[PDB]
Design a protein around this ligand. Structure first.
Ligand code: HEM
Ligand code: HEM
Ligand code: HEM
Ligand code: HEM
Ligand SMILES: [Ca+2]
Ligand SMILES: [Ca+2]
Lengths: 307, 308
């Protein structure tokens, strides 16, 4: 089969994953002292804010839909345009992004380094108490690699449990293959293995200006070519597409069939397609909320409002 | 001894607690779909946002410092001005407060009732799958009552363990008593047993307009009379006072000694006091980040920007 099962994450650097988990939930990575990775990739809600575009520092309206951190390591690159190569490189972006955490790499590292409890952990992981952006993002990336979603009802079906999904869902997987969805959405993450044009046969209408891969490569052929997203946990990651325009998976599957394949789905076919896509929802990360250390007199004060 | 030990939470109703935890972390209880109770009472950082005052809907600056939910069921009343009797009544407020979650009770219950997984849990706890603010806030309060902080160094000391706290911290505690702090800050939560004047001997110098109890009662005698906060986990719940004006416990202790007692602390005395107070940090809630059900076609969409 073109779709493969996701296996539970193997943790090989436990101290580092713990430090990463703390940092993913650390709102003092932001200027406000209020926004953490979790604010926009909420692990209680499919690893996303579930908004059309993000709400950032000062309630600024973000330019693009927040994708899920779930199974993000199976992606060939990171961000919609693939401008980051892995999760460690990606993590540098939000901290310093004015529309997101609104901080700087220098302020983030000073903030974390103010606290002996954090310094002790960087020392255990990397060899001394220095905090720099490489270590901080490396730790975050190590944690994110644990956020896989094994044991979806579909995975149980691929492993031979014929009763793990409905007949609607089984017919939907067949449609998925037979219509050509799988040509772009395949591998363990049902997506994430390639860049492809959004609007291959028919243009995709949006008033969102994001040009995708063209903004990394400079190639006009790369205009509106985006990373193919994962369809794992697609049930949870509404609204859909990079512009957050579509709230129902019903409409997303029909928009994809219409513009990627040249023909929308029937009522029955949509029912089946959605059934299959929901069966891709895996076991969500079970994480204990991390207990973060107190700020001290050396910790930069947050600036939620004026100064 | 005027301070008592915090015992671990007796969990008698774990299904309700579970439901309560989900709702406490549920950002779809806010109009924006972005703010939950945990936003302002962040359980990773002492049950508080650690901001001078809170960030609400549309990034509004709130009027007062968000208190910790840790040990809050020990409080004689809820809110700085004591306007809510207990955690259940309290929880109704923020959901409908325009400067906080900015939602309505009607929309909150419709939002939760839209999802079969939520309806199933309400049924399992209350007997049918109807959602109203009564059951919603009952479940949240059930979860909050579990958020006690046992096993602090000072508790170990009260129980007899002499090396539980430092020499400084021991001197700290005798000073806390001898100077009269314990007249207002006592019991299991080292606080929350009474409302007292902020600025008993001298005025509290603040630019914050909050009136305290007078705002609720109208009485001139209740002016700047506030619920005495818990000092449990005071290490973690900076900045201090209802105006969130002071970031160090050093300043906080000196301000109190001065304006509540007419007393000035030696540097060694302030350091002793701060060591004592630091010893009041207990074991933090150990909880699993709740997995919330997906919205569906009957779930009201979040409204992060629109005025309607
Ligand atoms: C260090 C903290 C953060 C981490 C580790 C993180 C993680 C990630 C990852 C892995 C991706 C790419 C996944 C993919 O392309 O499929 C991503 C993209 C994105 N995240 Fe975050 N995130 C963080 C902070 C934030 C915050 C605070 C916000 C909102 C204010 C946010 C909103 C977004 C948006 C809008 C994108 C897509 C941007 C683009 O494609 O250019 N992220 N994040
Ligand atoms: C009917 C068959 C298909 C179905 C049901 C389907 C399903 C989906 C869904 C549900 C999304 C939204 C993901 C998200 O927002 O996180 C999506 C996005 C996407 N898919 Fe498909 N897909 C199909 C066919 C294809 C084909 C044939 C291609 C390539 C030719 C493709 C490439 C993409 C791309 C580039 C995106 C991101 C588009 C954007 O938001 O700009 N898909 N797909
Ligand atoms: C239903 C969700 C919430 C719950 C269960 C909750 C819990 C509590 C509790 C127990 C108190 C009183 C504790 C005490 O006075 O000792 C309180 C007060 C307070 N909380 Fe929340 N909270 C919620 C939502 C929020 C949000 C979203 C914000 C920020 C936007 C916030 C900020 C505050 C503030 C500023 C106060 C003090 C207000 C006053 O004294 O008048 N709360 N909360
Ligand atoms: C040196 C002795 C004292 C110390 C070290 C002390 C400690 C503290 C601390 C650290 C706070 C900040 C709590 C927070 O912001 O959450 C506080 C607040 C408070 N304490 Fe004390 N306290 C002392 C004496 C007193 C006395 C004698 C009274 C009553 C007469 C009192 C009543 C209060 C009240 C009403 C508040 C809240 C005031 C406000 O922010 O509006 N304290 N105390
Ligand atoms: Ca989405
Ligand atoms: Ca405080």
């Amino acid at each position: 089969e073109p779709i493969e099962v996701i296996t539970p994450a193997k943790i090989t650097e436990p101290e580092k994953v713990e430090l990463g988990k703390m940092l993913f939930f650390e709102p003092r990575l932001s200027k406000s002292g209020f926004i953490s990775c979790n604010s926009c990739h909420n692990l209680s809600t499919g690893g996303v804010d579930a908004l059309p575009t993000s709400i950032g520092h000062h309630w600024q309206e973000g330019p693009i839909n927040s994708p899920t951190v779930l199974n993000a390591d199976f992606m060939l690159a990171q961000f919609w345009d693939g401008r980051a190569s892995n999760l460690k490189e990606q993590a540098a972006g939000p901290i310093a992004n004015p529309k997101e955490m609104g901080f700087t790499h220098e302020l983030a590292t000073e903030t974390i380094a103010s606290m002996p409890a954090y310094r002790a952990r960087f020392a255990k992981v990397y060899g001394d108490e220095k905090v720099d952006i490489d270590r901080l993002t490396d730790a975050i990336a190590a944690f994110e690699k644990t956020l896989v979603t094994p044991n979806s009802p579909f995975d149980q079906y691929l492993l031979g449990k014929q009763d793990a999904i409905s007949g609607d869902a089984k017919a939907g997987y067949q449609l998925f293959k037979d219509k050509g969805c799988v040509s772009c959405h395949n591998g363990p993450a049902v997506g994430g293995t390639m860049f492809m044009k959004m609007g291959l046969i028919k243009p995709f209408h949006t008033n969102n200006p994001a040009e995708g891969r063209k903004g990394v490569t400079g190639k006009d052929a790369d205009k509106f070519v985006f990373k193919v997203p994962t369809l794992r946990n697609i049930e949870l990651t509404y609204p859909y597409f990079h512009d957050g325009s579509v709230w129902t998976l019903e409409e997303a599957v029909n928009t994809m069939a219409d513009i990627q394949l040249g023909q929308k789905l029937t009522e029955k076919e949509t029912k089946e397609m959605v059934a299959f896509l929901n069966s891709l929802t895996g076991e969500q990360p079970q994480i204990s909320l991390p207990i973060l250390p107190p700020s001290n007199k050396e910790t930069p004060r947050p600036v939620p409002f004026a100064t």
